């Protein structure tokens with residue numbers, strides 16, 4: 514799976530090694546091996562979420578695994594909110610998650 | 624809606640509070656309440672647009688609202704070009720917009 | 734076409750003008766004119782790829798040109814791995830490419 518996290522938290526306000534803890538958490542949450550988990554964190558951005566510029570984060574999750582129902586993703590979403598609220602001291606209303614299906618042909622390795 | 628703006632303008636060359644003005648503009652343009660508008664600005668990137676490295680910007684707009692016709696989006700596009708040309712002193716040829724449909728199930732809140 | 738490259742290489746460790754060489758390479762690889770090629774490089778990010786935080790890069794390629802088969806993209810992928818391995822001194826296992834189809838209506842110019 515492919516995780517992309519944008520935040521207006523400055524790089525020096527983001528916990529050291531967040532990308533490592535999010536990778537291991539994502540493997541456990543999504544039930545995938547760690548060696549197939551990809552995380553990108555882009556801190557220090559200018560962001561407005563739900564109309565406001567308080568600290569926030571946007572998480573994109575892209576995977577062959579993504580099933581196009583709310584319920585299929587709701588347990589995953591709940592875990593990712595719990596992870597990000599504790600790591601970045603964000604309220605529940607300062608995080609949004611977007612899920613994107615992928616197919617095998619779209620992924621280039623070699 | 625979800626707005627993502629990449630630019631090669633350095634962070635200190637981007638107008639203070641662009642993310643706030645783009646959020647309010649987007650609400651007015653897309654006819655959505657401000658509290659459902661999300662903006663991310665990523666300045667200081669290395670960018671080539673239409674083959675050149677002059678100042679430029681790429682805007683992604685993702686929404687349940689996006690209708691898969693040029694004409695449905697053309698009035699929106701026109702407004703976003705007018706907004707970005709004036710804020711970032713870019714010519715019309717230095718901006719590209721991409722529209723992406725979303726469905727409700729893809730969005731995780733809580 | 735639209736190329737987006739994320740890397741954990743610091744901006745000052747990324748070769749000067751990578752965005753220009755990637756633009757010209759992409760035009761030659763994808764068989765498109767340079768003036769329709771768009772490249773974004775976002776360096777200095779925190780990244781884990783295949784579970785690890787060694788230097789890596791993620792390349793997204795979005796185009797009307799993208800055909801939904803592995804084989805249609807495999808020659809393109811091979812060229813982009815060859816380009817990035819030599820520019821960023823990354824091993825083959827430290828790069829992942831994702832291909833995304835676009836339709837004309839999604840692209841706003843003016």
Ligand SMILES: O=C(O)c1cccc(-c2cc(C(=O)O)ncc2C(=O)O)c1
Pocket residue numbers: 514515548549550575576577578615617620621622783829
């Ligand atoms: O399934 C494969 O063998 C394969 C081939 C290329 C890439 C991937 C892949 C897919 C996903 C995902 O969609 O969640 N995540 C990680 C990988 C990967 O192997 O890096 C998987």
Ligand SMILES: O=C(O)c1cccc(-c2cc(C(=O)O)ncc2C(=O)O)c1
Pocket residue numbers: 563609624625658659660685686687688725727730731732
């Ligand atoms: O429609 C809802 O109630 C709902 C639930 C979760 C997320 C969103 C949503 C959708 C969009 C959009 O697709 O343009 N924009 C903002 C939101 C949001 O409520 O944050 C809307």
Ligand SMILES: O=C(O)c1cccc(-c2cc(C(=O)O)ncc2C(=O)O)c1
Pocket residue numbers: 673719734735768769770795796797798835837840841842
């Ligand atoms: O085909 C067109 O005339 C046209 C109109 C608007 C945007 C684009 C376009 C499409 C792609 C692509 O999907 O690979 N790449 C570059 C462009 C562009 O003209 O900037 C093309």
